[PDB]
Design a protein around this ligand. Structure first.
Ligand code: HEM
Ligand code: HEM
Ligand code: HEM
Length: 71
C-alpha cells in the first residue's frame, strides 16, 4: 500500500505516504526534482531536515526514537 516502509534494523519507519500526501498537499517539500526517488535524503535527513525537521518544525509528526522506530 501507499505505506512506504523504509530500511532500519532499529525498527521500520512506516511512512503514511498517503496520509503525508494529504497532510502535505504540496508534494514538493518532500519531492524536490519531482515526485519519485529523492537524491540527498537518507538517515540524518529523517533525523532532521527530511522527516523530523518538519515534525519538529510543525510539531505534528513523530519526533522521538520511540515515535518512529517501532519494531
Ligand atoms: C502528493 C500527492 C504526492 C505524490 C503524488 C507523491 C508521489 C510519489 C511517487 C510517485 C513516489 C515514487 C514511488 C513510485 O515510483 O511508485 C514517491 C515516493 C516517496 N515520497 Fe511522495 N508523493 C507525494 C507526497 C509526499 C510527501 C508530502 C512526502 C513527505 C512528507 C513524500 C515522501 C516520499 C518518499 C520518502 C518517497 C520514497 C523515497 C524514500 O526515501 O524512500 N511524498 N512519492
Ligand atoms: C520522512 C520519510 C518522514 C517520515 C518517516 C515520517 C513519519 C511520520 C509518522 C510515522 C507520522 C505519524 C502520523 C500517523 O498517524 O501516521 C507522521 C506524522 C506527520 N508528519 Fe511526517 N514523516 C516524514 C516526513 C514529513 C515531512 C517532510 C513533513 C512536513 C513537510 C511531515 C509532516 C507530518 C505531519 C503533519 C504529521 C501529522 C499529520 C498532521 O498533523 O497533519 N512528515 N510522520
Ligand atoms: C532518536 C534520537 C533516534 C535514534 C537514536 C535513531 C536511530 C537510528 C539508527 C541507528 C538508524 C540506522 C538504521 C540501522 O542502524 O540499521 C536510523 C535510521 C532511520 N531513522 Fe531513526 N532514530 C531516532 C529517531 C527517528 C525518528 C523520530 C524518525 C522518524 C521521524 C526516524 C526515522 C528514521 C529513518 C527514516 C531511518 C532510515 C533512513 C531512510 O532513508 O529511511 N528516526 N535511526
Amino acid at each position: 500500500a501507499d505505506d512506504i516502509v523504509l530500511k532500519a534494523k532499529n525498527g521500520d519507519v512506516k511512512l503514511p505516504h498517503k496520509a503525508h500526501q494529504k497532510a502535505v498537499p504540496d508534494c514538493k517539500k518532500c519531492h524536490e526534482k519531482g515526485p519519485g526517488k529523492i537524491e540527498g535524503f537518507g538517515k540524518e535527513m529523517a533525523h532532521g531536515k527530511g522527516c523530523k525537521g518538519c515534525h519538529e518544525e510543525m510539531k505534528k509528526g513523530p519526533t522521538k526514537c520511540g515515535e518512529c522506530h517501532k519494531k
